[PDB]
Amino acid sequence: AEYQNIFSQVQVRGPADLGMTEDVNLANRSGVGPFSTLLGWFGNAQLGPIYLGSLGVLSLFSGLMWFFTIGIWFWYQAGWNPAVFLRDLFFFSLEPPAPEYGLSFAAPLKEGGLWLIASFFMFVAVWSWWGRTYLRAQALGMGKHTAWAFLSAIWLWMVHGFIYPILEGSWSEAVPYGIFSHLDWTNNFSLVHGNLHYNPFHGLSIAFLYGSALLFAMHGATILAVSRFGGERELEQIADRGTAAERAALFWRWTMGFNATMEGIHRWAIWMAVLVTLTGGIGILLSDTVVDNWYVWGQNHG
Amino acid sequence: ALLSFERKYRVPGGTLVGGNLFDFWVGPFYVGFFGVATFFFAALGIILIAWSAVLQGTWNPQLISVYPPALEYGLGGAPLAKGGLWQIITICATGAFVSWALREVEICRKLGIGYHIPFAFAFAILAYLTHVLFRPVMMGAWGYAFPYGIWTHLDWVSNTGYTYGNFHYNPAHMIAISFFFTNALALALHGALVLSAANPEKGKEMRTPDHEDTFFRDLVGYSIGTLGIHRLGLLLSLSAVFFSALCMIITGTIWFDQWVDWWQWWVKLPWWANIPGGING
Amino acid sequence: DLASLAIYSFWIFLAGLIYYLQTENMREGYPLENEDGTPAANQGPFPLPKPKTFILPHGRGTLTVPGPESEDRPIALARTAVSEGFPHAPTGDPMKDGVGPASWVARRDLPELDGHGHNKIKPMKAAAGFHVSAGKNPIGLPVRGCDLEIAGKVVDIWVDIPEQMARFLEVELKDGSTRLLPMQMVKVQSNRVHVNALSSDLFAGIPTIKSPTEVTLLEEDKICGYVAGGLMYAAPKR
Ligand code: BCL
Ligand code: BCL
Ligand code: BCL
Ligand code: BCL
Ligand SMILES: CC[C@H]1c2cc3[nH]c4c(c3C)C(=O)[C@H](C(=O)OC)c4c3nc(cc4[nH]c(cc(n2)[C@@H]1C)c(C(C)=O)c4C)[C@@H](C)[C@@H]3CCC(=O)OC/C=C(\C)CCC[C@H](C)CCC[C@H](C)CCCC(C)C
Ligand SMILES: CC[C@H]1c2cc3[nH]c4c(c3C)C(=O)[C@H](C(=O)OC)c4c3nc(cc4[nH]c(cc(n2)[C@@H]1C)c(C(C)=O)c4C)[C@@H](C)[C@@H]3CCC(=O)OC/C=C(\C)CCC[C@H](C)CCC[C@H](C)CCCC(C)C
Ligand SMILES: [Fe+3]
Ligand SMILES: [Mn+2]
DSSP: OOOOOSSOSSEEEOSOOOOOOTTOOGGGBOOOOOBOSSGGGTSOOBBOOOBOOHHHHHHHHHHHHHHHHHHHHHHHHTTTOHHHHHHGGGTOEEOOOOTTTTTOSOOOIIIIIHHHHHHHHHHHHHHHHHHHHHHHHHHTTOOTHHHHHHHHHHHHHHHHTTHHHHHTSOGGGSOOEESSHHHHHHHHHHHBTBOTTTOHHHHHHHHHHHHHHHHHHHHHHHHHHTTTTTOSOHHHHHTTOOHHHHHHHHHHHTTSSOOOOTTTHHHHHHHHHHTHHHHHHHHHHHBTTTBSOTTTHHHHOO | OBOTTOTTTOOSOOOSSSTTTTOOEETBEEOHHHHHHHHHHHHHHHHHHHHHHHTTTOOOTTTOEEOOOOGGGTTSOOOIIIIIHHHHHHHHHHHHHHHHHHHHHHHHHHTTOOSHHHHHHHHHHHHHHIIIIIHHHHTTOGGGSOOEETTHHHHHHHHHHHTTSOSTTSSHHHHHHHHHHHHHHHHHHHHHHHHHHHSOSTTSOOOOHHHHHHHHHHHHSBOOHHHHHHHHHHHHHHHHHHHHHHHHHSBTTTBOSOHHHHTHHHHTOHHHHSOOOTTOO | OHHHHHHHHHHHHHHHHHHHHHHHTTTTTOSOBOTTSOBOSOOOSOOOOOOEEEOOSTTOOOEEESOOOOOOSOOOEEESSSSSSOOEEESSOHHHHTOGGGOOOOOOSSOOBOSSSSBSEEEGGGSTTOEEEESOOOTTOEEEOTTSOEEEEEEEEEEETTTOOEEEEEEEETTSOEEOOBGGGOOOOSSOEEOSSOOGGGTTTSOOOSOSSOOOHHHHHHHHHHHHHHHHHSTTTO
16 A cells, blocks of 8 residues: 555654745744644654734734624623523624614614624724735735635625615624524525525625535645645646646547646636636525525526 | 547556456547446436336426336336336346446556446445435335436425425435535635635735635635635535435435424423423414 | 516526636647657647746746646657557556657656755654654655565655655665655555555656756656556565
């Protein structure tokens, strides 16, 4: 039997590589953390350092408040009782304000107003955060690829709890922070607009999600069978092809009628997925406002 | 008909069976015994897919569809039209994913690399099998499987799920869902990185596998590093699918009731089980 | 309606992405060559993209693809048949010759750098502060081939300084010289390193490095490659 380089067989360490530097302000860099012999069987064993700018704080700060505001209220419902808390942990839920309030900011604390608070923070913490991944990429004079891909999500997120909700007139159309509740919220939304198996921008999103699990499953299996040729180094194969990428290639082209490259395969991917939340943000964005039943429209196509 | 660097490879060998007999190409397509096989099965299949569309009385694809043998047949033979074909059409579909897997193997041998690929692939095979071979035999009835159809199999999913109410509650199916989510978040990145390392701001030198790392670390205080990621991925997926196949082999055989119910066991725990307040008191 | 519109228009958007994608993936390997290396008739439906330029680092230059395709070397292979798509016999010894599974590429005779500009791949004994931090250390351990005979021993491990990772095992052969082996192709155990790929007697054949403290990209390929090839040409002894 052979080595499947799934986990390394030997670990090795050296000092801490405090990372490149370029324009980055090393002042906001943190001190390095410890090395785990754990992650080490899988990937790096090095933890840290971490760049916490002003933005890094903001985002994280609102990040908690958000997460906290949800805690308080869960504590309220459990009647300040721990065991309860631990028992009904999943059924608790901070629901949006009521349909009557529509899109107003008067909603009484106990009915929506605490749900608004929490969202307010989540926004800020999601946008400020996106933002960081920009700058960091900039401090690295690197491709805003990442900063873009992420947006793709913020997309779906933005529709799911702000765009769509503003288009149906009321806060009561958004999702509630809850573990089982939102689960259902989904289910209902499915039934409330014909069946979603029909909404095509949903049939599509399925495709990609699925697709990303098909692709990624490949790229990895692949890279792995051609590491014994220093293939993991996709970067330096790009700039100076090796037998790694050649072999990566011919296997697929002798298999499925074609092939990618080492830079390329990375663009397939990137999209293959960026599109799950893209097609989506649409799909949902349409059901109800532009199409009240999806089965129907599966008959007329208008 | 060949890539610029294709010739220095096309040597003979790599055959698991038949020797050189089928050791050759056709278009950029490798062949081998299994190349053939998946041809045999595929065709034979596409054909019995045409007989049921006539026996069905239509040639619109979205409409075409072939159905399992109804519950009444059990786990035995069924008249063509009512399951019979569905049965041979599955056989074929099977022999062709399998063949298609082995051929891949021969390739990993002529190209002398890893078996990571077909291996990986063997999972989606499994996932398939569960559907048309495992779950059914335990629930004792072919019928329980899905219908090969463009929308009919969708409805096969829609009703089967709801047979257990909201399916979100089947927990094994929560798991499966997480992976199908991260995985994708993964590829999302790998691709954003690699490419944000490889296509820097205009005017600068390619970046380095070193820059990649620094990113994340300065972003989420950690890097799994280029080999790991590519390992992470293999897992995120194979798992995501390992589990699905799981939450289905259990639905109807060991848990068949309301899924959402299952979850009582937790709230119905001695200590807190009674206490008043919350949502279950 | 707005929904029909949007669903078509996406299709269009989707087609065009496919394009862009497909092309982008041809900056290498393309154009196709006939079985004698002369351009091909049918280049398919997709065109060669307009060349793009990579500004390599550490002044090592520029890369521009699509570029002028060159194997840059001799291929000891000949047709076994009259018509196309057949195998291509190895005139001699595929191992030495650099063909098939053993094939190796003409990549710069330079080594991979890290991002600071100092040699990416170094050998432990010179790697400052680098030690084995976990697992069965193979240093001093005996190397056994596929025929089950000893062939040398381990004297050092080379490591990816930046990615703190292990990629090779400097092996000292019977004749006092060393050969590098591909981690990913060895199976360290309790009392021995076991290489399935090669048998004792071919260990020598493993190509050598000019510098003992660094290895050039071109150099890695030749090794691994040779190593690989072992899987199929070394089988009559394994
Ligand atoms: C996983 C749980 C359910 C299931 C649930 C769903 C759900 C839910 C959805 C689909 C959807 C799809 N499913 Mg399904 N599907 C199942 C099992 C299968 C099997 C099988 C052999 O078991 C097949 C071929 C398919 C195929 C398909 C696609 C036609 C379509 C998705 C596109 C996609 O993302 O592809 C991923 C892979 C690729 C893009 C690769 C390219 C290969 C293409 C897709 C092959 C098409 C083959 C054609 C159907 C068969 C031709 C055979 C003839 C003999 C020539 N499903 C099981 C039973 N499927 C989606 C849909 O309805 O879209 C309109 C959708 O929303
Ligand atoms: C029973 C209900 C319906 C149904 C109803 C819906 C509904 C309703 C929706 C989907 C949506 C989706 N469905 Mg569905 N769906 C059904 C059946 C299926 C089947 C199947 C095989 O049967 C499949 C494959 C799918 C697949 C999919 C996906 C393609 C898509 C979601 C992508 C995603 O990952 O979003 C998840 C990704 C994100 C949320 C990314 C954004 C990340 C955010 C911003 C991060 C927040 C972080 C937080 C602040 C921090 C937390 C951690 C901190 C440490 C605290 N559905 C059934 C039939 N489906 C969604 C869609 O958009 O459809 C068009 C959607 O709205
Ligand atoms: C698009 C379709 C639906 C939808 C459909 C589904 C479906 C279907 C499933 C989930 C599941 C989950 N969904 Mg959801 N989900 C939607 C919108 C959201 C929103 C939001 C702000 O809009 C959030 C925070 C979540 C969050 C979650 C997770 C709790 C859980 C998945 C784990 C996972 O894969 O993690 C991946 C995470 C990462 C890669 C990031 C790391 C973050 C870590 C793991 C911490 C997460 C903490 C969690 C969010 C805390 C919740 C408690 C707070 C008090 C609110 N969903 C929309 C409305 N969701 C799955 C489940 O079963 O859960 C139990 C599941 O099956
Ligand atoms: C109301 C319905 C229920 C529900 C009921 C079910 C049920 C019931 C099932 C799933 C299953 C799945 N569900 Mg669900 N599911 C729901 C909601 C969701 C949501 C969501 C966001 O709401 C999500 C993300 C999912 C996600 C998922 C997936 C994890 C999983 C299917 C993937 C898989 O492994 O396929 C398996 C993949 C394969 C079989 C494909 C293998 C490839 C084959 C062999 C090759 C085909 C080749 C082709 C014919 C030829 C191509 C060649 C041509 C020339 C091109 N569900 C709701 C709540 N879900 C399924 C599962 O777990 O399956 C195991 C399942 O049975
Ligand atoms: C195709 C789209 C895919 C995708 C992409 C994606 N997600 C992304 C990105 C991208 C490209 C990011 O750049 C961003 C990221 O940063 O990723 C690493 C992100 C991200 N995707 C996330 C989640 C996520 N993505 C998902 C999905 C997907 N993401 C898709 C598959 C899903 C699911 C399950 O479908 C989830 C849950 C986030 C983790 C992350 C963006 C982070 C964010 O928005 O944060 C706001 C800030 C907070 C929540 C801060 C507080 C966190 C804790 C509550 C703190 C409390 C404890 C701590 C110990 C306290 C310490 C205190 C100190 C004082 C000591
Ligand atoms: C972790 C599991 C994930 C995964 C992995 C995966 N798929 C893989 C591999 C791997 C590792 C491959 O190596 C292999 C490949 O080579 O891909 C390029 C493949 C592959 N995954 C494929 C499809 C596929 N994978 C899917 C999913 C997934 N694959 C998961 C997300 C799905 C979805 C989303 O459901 C599909 C459709 C194939 C394109 C390809 C393998 C090629 C192949 O099997 O070819 C031979 C094909 C035939 C012989 C087709 C004809 C068959 C019969 C004669 C008739 C048709 C019968 C069938 C029942 C009809 C169904 C109709 C529906 C409408 C109901
Ligand atoms: Fe990659
Ligand atoms: Mn509505």
